């Protein structure tokens, strides 16, 4: 549940209704605007979702736009997020809504002292 809402009811929501259920950061992000190129990226994303076999994982789509709000349109896709060097493929969950894509890809090696 994102606001106490069932999952499949969330899935078929538009972007703007998810802004109607969003926190202040997501609302003010979408209220200023969005670039035209992620629309074609979402068309490629849904085409690769249409290239998915039944009862399995979809085609992983590689992504650079780390600042994009995970809208419930993209729940279930296997996405390889680019950390600055490499792509990391994670299945988008309903637990991942409202987040940037940058929150799910570590961009550096850990520092080991002791």
């Amino acid at each position: 549940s994102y606001r106490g809402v069932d999952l499949e009811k969330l899935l078929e929501m538009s972007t703007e209704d998810f802004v109607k259920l969003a926190p202040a950061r997501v609302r003010r992000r979408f209220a200023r605007g969005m670039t035209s190129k992620p629309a074609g990226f979402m068309k490629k994303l849904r085409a690769a979702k249409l290239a998915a076999p039944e009862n399995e994982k979809p085609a992983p789509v590689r992504t650079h736009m780390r600042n994009m709000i995970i809208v419930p349109e993209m729940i279930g896709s296997v996405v390889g997020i680019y950390n600055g060097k490499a792509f990391n493929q994670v299945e988008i969950r309903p637990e991942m809504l409202g987040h940037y894509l940058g929150e799910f890809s570590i961009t550096y090696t850990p520092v080991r002292h002791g």
Binding site: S1, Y2, R3, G4, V5, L21
Partner: protein
Amino acid sequence: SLVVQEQGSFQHILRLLNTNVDGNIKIVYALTTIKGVGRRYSNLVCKKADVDLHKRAGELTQEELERIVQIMQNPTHYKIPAWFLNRQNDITDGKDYHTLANNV
């Protein structure tokens, strides 16, 4: 002011919401002892309960403790709106919670 003296009748340490409260501080700063409750929260609760907050917590009747607990489980029904509570606009339920002391 007038020295209003009481023949005993006050308890040293009360217990409320499963947590020990010292019945010698002001009621704001005695209910501040429990978790999830600070200074202004206990202050506004006891102003909605109309509690004399210059009175200490030993001179407080348990009926006002019941009023304070009723404002604990009902903050939004007693004209304390959403800005004043702990967990506003949740993700699990979409509601406003004031997370209490031992329920964290």
